[PDB]
Design a protein around this ligand. Sequence first.
Ligand code: GDP
Ligand code: GDP
Lengths: 256, 253
Amino acid sequence: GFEFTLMVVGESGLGKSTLINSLFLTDLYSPEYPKTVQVEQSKVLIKEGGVQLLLTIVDTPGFGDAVDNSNCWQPVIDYIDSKFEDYLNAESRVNRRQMPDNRVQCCLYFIAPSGHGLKPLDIEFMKRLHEKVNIIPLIAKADTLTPEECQQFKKQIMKEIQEHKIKIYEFPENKLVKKIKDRLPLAVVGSNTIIEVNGKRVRGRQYPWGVAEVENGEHCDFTILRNMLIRTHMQDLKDVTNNVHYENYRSRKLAA
Amino acid sequence: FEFTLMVVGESGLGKSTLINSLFLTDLYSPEYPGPSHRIKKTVQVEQSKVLIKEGGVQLLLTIVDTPGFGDAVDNSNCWQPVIDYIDSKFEDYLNAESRVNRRQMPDNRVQCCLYFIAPSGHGLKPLDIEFMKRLHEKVNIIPLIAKADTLTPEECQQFKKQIMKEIQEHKIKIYEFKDRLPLAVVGSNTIIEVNGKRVRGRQYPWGVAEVENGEHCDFTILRNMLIRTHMQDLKDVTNNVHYENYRSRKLAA
Ligand SMILES: Nc1nc2c(ncn2[C@@H]2O[C@H](COP(=O)(O)OP(=O)(O)O)[C@@H](O)[C@H]2O)c(=O)[nH]1
Ligand SMILES: Nc1nc2c(ncn2[C@@H]2O[C@H](COP(=O)(O)OP(=O)(O)O)[C@@H](O)[C@H]2O)c(=O)[nH]1
């Protein structure tokens, strides 16, 4: 059995719940929100192929949705640092045989597909959280970008990430293989709707002019994201959470 | 013939593309780009003009845009520059028609405001509600669902209905003009061959969203009514309702 704590952040209506529900092809996440940002948790135990995953989904309804979003990152910081604080207290006890670990191991940050670059709120959130959680920036609703637009948008976002000295999670990796960092930020399409396309039933979004396919790597990066989040990089995300973000929290608190 | 058209909405909603799609040529240019390229530390209202020669007819078009609207972390009062601009043009007109010698009477009143709603698929955002409630009695608001190729047909019908319900709930008076409201638009100046015919559209790997295809979006309806059929009625409502209401308010006080 594994445990994974995954945080989702972005303005309402970016396909976030749809994306979570696409991860296990199951509408297992139905948040009530479609005041100040509230940080909430949902637990799902997934048993599939003789393996159990206890997934905690941490969401932040209200983020970025108000006229005045001043300090809307602060409830997110408070939640994350409070789990570091609990862990530090738990491991400092004389008897620590029971160790709960509620630390947030990944944050999907959904970027609206404007076609320009990052918004001021995107920059503030990532600058203020990047040393506290593994940030995976995602271009939301990628089926609203043409391929040329998507490539320009990715390049502009990565340039601005560098400009603001933001440290995102980059998915550390006999023939040459394109580097994953060259694909970032991943651009996703979500759907559990099955559509017949040329005699094959696929998940996608049906428009009068055609179908944007979730699992088609020429349409979006969902398959790559799902493979890394659930299978190949989950342990590394936990490792960085513990060995970097938590250890940096602890050293700061103990030195003070 | 003259017309003053305002566009308002957060950056990245296709606003400059839509203005560039209304006619045969682009209107924004590298020398005067769309409002997302003119953002300052505070929201601004900027006016530009172009002479359009369409169908043997000359249109002197003023475009008023508002760089930075809706783009900040704190968008408090970001509608105020728009209000100030609109009411200033009403003030200029009242001053002009109050002169003893009023032979000179320029008219710069804003005659239509396209307000771009992001296609979330849920409902209006708080900012959308605030803007429309605060401006609907100063200018003819035409709400638009931006980037409508973001929505499946069913999602779009649901989004339209929810927006209209919220418009009614908040008592917002949008420009009247048929039950396809708000119009959902797709913009593009890209010409694409689709089954042997050149059309304006947006080319995805899975197909082409056609801007002038009424089954793909409402751009044709907006273009025909804004530029051809309802332009004079927009001016008349501007003068006979919004300006006269400004004037009665100011002269009462
Ligand atoms: N264009 C597009 N729309 C999507 C996608 N995923 C979900 N949607 C639609 O966007 C709307 C909001 O999706 P939802 O998952 O509730 O977003 P949330 O508020 O961020 O959780 C719904 O109409 C969805 O059907 C996507 O990948 N592309
Ligand atoms: N999906 C979609 N994208 C569009 C549409 N119109 C323009 N775009 C793209 O959206 C991005 C922003 O467009 P722009 O006109 O600069 O928006 P503005 O900032 O509001 O003026 C550009 O990449 C455009 O090519 C549309 O109708 N649908």
